[PDB]
Amino acid sequence: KTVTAVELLVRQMEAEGVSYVFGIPGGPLMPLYEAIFSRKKIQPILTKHEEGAAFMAEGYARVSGKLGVCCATTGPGATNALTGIACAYSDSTPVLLLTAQVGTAAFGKGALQESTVHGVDLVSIFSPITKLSVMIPTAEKMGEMTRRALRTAQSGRPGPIHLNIPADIAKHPVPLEVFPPMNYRGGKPAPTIMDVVRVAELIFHAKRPAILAGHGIECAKAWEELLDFAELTGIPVATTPKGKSSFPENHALSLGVFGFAGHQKATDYLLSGDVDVLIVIGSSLGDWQTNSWDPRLTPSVALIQIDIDPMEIGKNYPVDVGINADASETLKALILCIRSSGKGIHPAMVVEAMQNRLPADTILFVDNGSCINWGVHCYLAQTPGAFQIGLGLAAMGHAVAAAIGGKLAAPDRPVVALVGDAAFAMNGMEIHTAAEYKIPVTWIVLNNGGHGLVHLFEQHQFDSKFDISSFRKSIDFCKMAESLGVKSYRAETVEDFDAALKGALAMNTPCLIDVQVDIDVLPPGMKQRF
Amino acid sequence: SKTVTAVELLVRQMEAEGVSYVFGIPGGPLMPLYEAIFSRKKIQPILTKHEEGAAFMAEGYARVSGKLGVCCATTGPGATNALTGIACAYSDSTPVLLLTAQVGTAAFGKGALQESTVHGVDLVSIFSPITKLSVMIPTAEKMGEMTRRALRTAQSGRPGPIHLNIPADIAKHPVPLEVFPPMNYRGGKPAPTIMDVVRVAELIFHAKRPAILAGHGIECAKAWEELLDFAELTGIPVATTPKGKSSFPENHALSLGVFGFAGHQKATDYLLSGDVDVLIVIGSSLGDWQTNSWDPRLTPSVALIQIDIDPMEIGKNYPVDVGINADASETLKALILCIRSSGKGIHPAMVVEAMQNRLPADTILFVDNGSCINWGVHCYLAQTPGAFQIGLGLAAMGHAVAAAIGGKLAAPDRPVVALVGDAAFAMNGMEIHTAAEYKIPVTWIVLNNGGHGLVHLFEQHQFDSKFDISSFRKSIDFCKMAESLGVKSYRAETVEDFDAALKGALAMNTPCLIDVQVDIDVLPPGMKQRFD
């Protein structure tokens, strides 16, 4: 019994529990749409820009915990998505990008939007920022390739995949071979027992242990065993800026965020070296996460690091025990072994109004810009994984679009995006797609009339010698929401903001809130990095 | 022995190449570059709303400039956004220089903020397949030589884009003043052999039914005058490729229109009938849309001549009898010398008509990708050389939307109009804010048919409408979108509101947008042809 090669790929994608595919169609990429629409199990989402779809697939992935899928046509369709694929690459999230190719009969001829080595070579443009980038050579090889793709995206440190599909093979017949995921993909690695008992032994003798939880806690879905491990051990837990959300910040053992725009209940504990035992679980230990690799973060006795990627272990700090394993399989073993022992408006208040009204289960997406300083510092996130910030690449526009995918992945939970205005101008057009698909998301535009943080570097680094930051005319984001069919609120006092915010969440449809913000307000954590 | 920072010397040499703007968005590590431009007071920076628009602006400026276009973007996502614009510069053979930041060397491999090395997001290797050169500045001293290498590479041979990556720490290291005029580090252009020019001369002399196919290469060589003098001196008719529309006056007696996609029956019949004996191809790559999917009937009976500055294009899809590797302007000047010395809603079809009946003769017309290509290429008549700007090499949606702003910065005292689809404007539509900011009078004509016109036509004409991925449930309102960005706008539901709107647009000398309601089921010209 046969199917068309591209028909078998969606059926294999169905088996991975992929529910939506975001993208923009094209001549050579239509065979895929006729296939997704033949099955009616997976649904296609038409976006306004291919980076917006990629950003959505990434957003769907991180909250879904499943594989994100986006599609694009030959050439510029594909190149458009790149920045989103580059963010999925730096945040360790499994995104599969499907791109079309011209038929082999036109290779080297100057085909329309040719994406081979002879034209715009997608597979090598996309290699440095994917776990795998490959053109399917034959129809017959579609099953084994797409299982190769799904296996690579969600094993090890997860990441994005680029699959290039020549339009001609897309409808060649092939045998129907669809497998459940666990038949062609392995499980995760656990720590050796020798290391589990050595750090158990280091915790038992510690005068001041501390845990630094990074983004790996979310990819490992390790919140519960982290919460049980901290509670059982009594060790205080700090998050990276990107790892905020991975431990409840209301909890007695919570020190908040360590690093950029962080809290100094974390700074002192972790930086004023009383610390002797440091357990780093699922963090790159990059710039922001370490306060520019401050040598004072190193503990006096032992540094322990758990990470599913061996190459990150001991990269910037010498480790005493380096565990190459899943954070969730490591922690349950650790608990198993220790219980076995038995012995305008000021942004500060716009976050303030948000904390007083967003439901407990609100997923908060934050963009890149001064909104990260406000988001990481002043919002307290109590629900596991409910704080969504893309600090891997820190691309402006990320959450503006990301969030749409997040609410498709968690439709019964409220989803809110806190974004800057220049970021909204880069990807704000995708509120039209939420409008078209009736995806109720609330964007909170922190409108300071330009590039907030760049304005501050000018003043504080090149003594107001020039201005490349401010606008001469602020954008009108409520008129813009109106053009895109989205209900809108303007707020220039705190209480207009609160009225807007509780109207939006009642609203059952997309909504945008345009907040007046002074471009000179110095965000938390910006004067320390200067 | 005057010393200056490397980034000042980069700017100073760019000044020598006549670049007048740098399009981009600032960032932490890229701020030294902006500090340099503002202290020098010559080149001016344009802050755009997306870096892809900045690269679109630089491509448009270069194409109208005849000079080098420059954009800048920061580490990581800054540069990746610009990719599609650089890939467009690469497929249309436009000299664009994209300057991108790199974190300081002391943070390589450490996980620095938006690290764009081999250890992070590899800018130099991402940009390698769609640039003539992509290289990270290794040291401060090599800024002079690497910047002179980029200008020579971008504007020599077949022109194309360049990627220069600059580590943020070496930007501010002092280097010796070392600035040269453009003709001390780049060569001139190649001419044909005397042997081949007289061999082509002697073929046209004996040709019964010769024909010329003029492609985009005529604009890159700045060869319009001698192409018209070559056709006039020889009496042989001129057809263009769809992308070369503005290279041969269509109001001339010898003009054949466009041959290929959405072309004219005049051009197809002469070149495909089977009565041509000598065909000269000047500057076209002879790809799909340039040759009706490589119809073998384009082969001439006697001799095919191909002229092209890139040798690897000669005879690629059709066998040539004379293959000249030379610049098109120097070839045409030699052939003329050697023969003279010899001595012996609204229907879009009526929207562009309203446009041609009203727009000045010197208007530079930008067209985006979508049905506007069928309407622009087929129904618009272009009489001015280079006055039609369409990026058909990559055919990236949204290209004309932003590029026209760069075009009008390059030709400030000529009218510039962009004819774009509604989905195209939705991806890069927000750049009009940049035009409102800098007071750049461009007129956008949005053919708003409420979704993806040609894809909807594919559904009907290849999937029998088994599905709809093409129309939006709610047409976007582009006059409200214009208004919120500070741009004057007009809506048109009649043909006359369009004529009133367009005539208002041109008088105002400010940015303006005209939102035209169009039926999405209208079959554009040349779309019937392309279905099989």
Ligand SMILES: Cc1ncc(C[n+]2c([C@H](O)C3CCC3)sc(CCOP(=O)(O)OP(=O)(O)O)c2C)c(N)n1
């Ligand atoms: C795609 C992309 N292109 C450029 C940047 C660089 N970049 C910022 C970085 O974080 C570092 C802060 C110095 C560089 S920040 C910021 C202004 C945001 O302006 P807005 O959106 O309005 O936010 P705000 O006004 O609240 O500051 C910009 C442009 C980026 N990150 N991504």
Ligand SMILES: Cc1ncc(C[n+]2c([C@H](O)C3CCC3)sc(CCOP(=O)(O)OP(=O)(O)O)c2C)c(N)n1
């Ligand atoms: C960046 C980018 N992403 C996708 C495409 C594919 N694509 C077109 C190509 O040429 C081929 C013709 C079918 C594929 S065309 C068109 C819609 C026009 O929508 P509009 O702007 O409204 O134009 P129109 O209404 O007249 O059809 C689209 C989406 C593209 N080119 N670039």
Ligand SMILES: Nc1ncnc2c1ncn2[C@@H]1O[C@H](COP(=O)(O)OP(=O)(O)O)[C@@H](O)[C@H]1O
């Ligand atoms: N399932 C997992 N278990 C443990 N660690 C993981 C897992 N998945 C990813 N990681 C690790 O988490 C780290 C996340 O680092 P990054 O994405 O830079 O976050 P942060 O900046 O918060 O440290 C990476 O080093 C990655 O190898």
Ligand SMILES: Nc1ncnc2c1ncn2[C@@H]1O[C@H](COP(=O)(O)OP(=O)(O)O)[C@@H](O)[C@H]1O
């Ligand atoms: N200065 C020049 N003189 C002559 N030909 C050129 C010059 N610059 C570029 N070309 C050629 O013009 C061609 C442009 O092709 P393309 O971009 O596909 O336009 P079209 O579709 O009209 O062929 C390329 O083959 C290139 O080698």
Ligand SMILES: [Mg+2]
């Ligand atoms: Mg702002």
Ligand SMILES: [Mg+2]
């Ligand atoms: Mg349209």
